[PDB]
Design a protein around this ligand. Structure first.
Ligand SMILES: Cc1c(C=C(CO)CO)[nH]c(=O)[nH]c1=O
Ligand SMILES: Cc1c(C=C(CO)CO)[nH]c(=O)[nH]c1=O
Lengths: 314, 309
């Protein structure tokens, strides 16, 4: 069977992900690489009206005390549903086409602007740190993360906070929120550590007690306090006896299952756009390909990505 | 490897679903059958405060014009997330234990509801009540977990008048008696049964889609008819692809489910007997590990103890 390479470019907004990706895509022949872009049209028009603006306005009014935490949370939870829909359907339609992990060049490379976990985990977790989502709703999103397909390569981004702030403070409906920037940077850092922790054999249930008061593909096993598991020692989630309610513990089991089979890479964005492109190109050499399940899978997948791009891209 | 029988008791609430199942659970051995009950404690306390109350109060305020459709929709959407969480975690932890199709089962696992109740049926009913956008409904649909082998779902049959009578006598905490919601949820579940049949007899929604504007049910009698919603269509009338893919997901998830209808228009002991009768045609699966069976038992009783009333 012909092989496929799937690459999800993810991480905090404002690092140059979209630019780097387009530059990579520009290197290939028309139909040996396809881009699944940010579905900004879904977010702005098709799924609901100006969702990004809604999110940033709701946080602002919370921060100004014009609305309650409860009001903010129902809006953020609803908006996140809308935000995540295109990632979820794409994953669901792709799934039956993906075979086992498989090296000769892939017949097709599919690059995505973000993985479903961005909207079903990372942004919710950050909004929780911002006080605008409950940890129960974050764990409800986690419970809904789809099974992790073979050959899930995720590229996360590294960038010094100062450079990141500057790059953001220049270049939707977004507002310049440094607290949110810190939160989402923390969350993606925890994410990278979580994958490495799991792949190094870490068992969150075994280490849960070590809680009280980044890189993957490399390094020693992180402490559980430097992983996503640390976010869920919240009093809302704990029984009177001090333990996690089982319903929430099962959600963390799901979190561990979903993240542990992912292949995570870190891209250094602190360079020129062409620099990021070539760094990303070199990085793909260590990435995991898969077989597809049918002969016609490749052109089908190609049609799906282009259809997506046309309808939901800017 | 030992065999498992999973049975999801579902359908509109207020038919006597809960009474029927608890009687049945009390006929078989303490540990050849386990009941995963309604996660009412999650809904009222663990996940959020009085989610049911929240849901019915929001719809009431909408009906009275005290809040906008947009306001109601964000609340209904968030609430449905809370409502379905125990079903979704349960499915996700159970999923690796389920093997292929498979003589009595080593274990019978009876659930109060399937994840589609909260990820499809109640959202679609609220759409019909003007309190959820069809885009949010399709987002929930996109997240319906893959349908595992042996997914046996029991739906209810009950005349509307009798249903109103039963419902009135067993309101849940915070619930309001809403005949419009009763009709919406009854219609959604009727369309669901038809949809499974339509799909199983080889119906293709894309091929029949034109019929909504111009041997199996007519597509106008399935859930697909709900998604002719104008919010989902381009200026030229075409369904946006992103919504069409969500319908492809809906089709895939539903066609492999095994539906059984339970007539609730009888006595509780009768309902119990009828449910036991329905089991002979249900599909069993193997489990995947020697340890799967006791792990499942442990999950089920823990769920019950922590989240059941
Ligand atoms: C994916 C995602 C985003 C991403 C961006 C674009 O990078 C807009 O903030 N923002 C948000 O608030 N929630 C989300 O799920
Ligand atoms: C499952 C479910 C219900 C059902 C019950 C009673 O079975 C509680 O209202 N009600 C609701 O409003 N949303 C839901 O997802």
């Amino acid at each position: 069977m012909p092989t496929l390479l799937r690459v999800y470019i993810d991480g905090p907004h404002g690092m140059g992900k979209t630019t780097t990706t387009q530059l990579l895509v520009a290197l290939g022949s028309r139909d040996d690489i396809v881009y699944v872009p940010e579905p900004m049209t879904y977010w702005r028009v098709l799924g609901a009206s100006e969702t990004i603006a809604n999110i940033y306005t709701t946080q602002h009014r919370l921060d100004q005390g014009e609305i309650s935490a409860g009001d903010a949370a129902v809006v953020m939870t609803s908006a996140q549903i809308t935000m995540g829909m295109p990632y979820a359907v794409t994953d669901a339609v792709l799934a039956p086409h993906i075979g086992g992990e498989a090296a000769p060049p892939p017949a097709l490379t599919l690059i995505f602007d973000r993985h479903p976990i961005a909207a079903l985990l990372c942004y919710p977790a950050a909004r929780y740190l911002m006080g605008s989502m409950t940890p129960q709703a974050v764990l409800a999103f986690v419970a809904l993360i789809p099974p992790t397909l073979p050959g899930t390569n995720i590229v996360l981004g590294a960038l010094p906070e100062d450079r990141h702030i500057d790059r953001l403070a220049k270049r939707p409906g977004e507002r310049l929120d440094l607290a949110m920037l810190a939160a989402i940077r923390r969350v993606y850092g925890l994410l990278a550590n979580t994958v490495r922790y799991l792949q190094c054999g870490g068992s969150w249930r075994e280490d849960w007690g070590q809680l009280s008061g980044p890189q993957s593909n490399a390094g020693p096993r992180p402490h559980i306090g430097d992983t996503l598991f640390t976010l869920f020692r919240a009093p809302e989630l704990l029984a009177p006896n001090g333990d996690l309610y089982n319903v929430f513990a099962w959600a963390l089991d799901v979190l561990a299952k979903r993240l542990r089979s992912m292949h995570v890479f870190i891209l250094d964005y602190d360079q020129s756009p062409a620099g990021c492109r070539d760094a990303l190109l070199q990085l793909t050499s260590g990435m995991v390909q898969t077989h597809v399940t049918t002969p016609g899978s490749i052109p089908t997948i190609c049609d799906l990505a282009r259809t997506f791009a046309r309808e939901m891209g800017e």
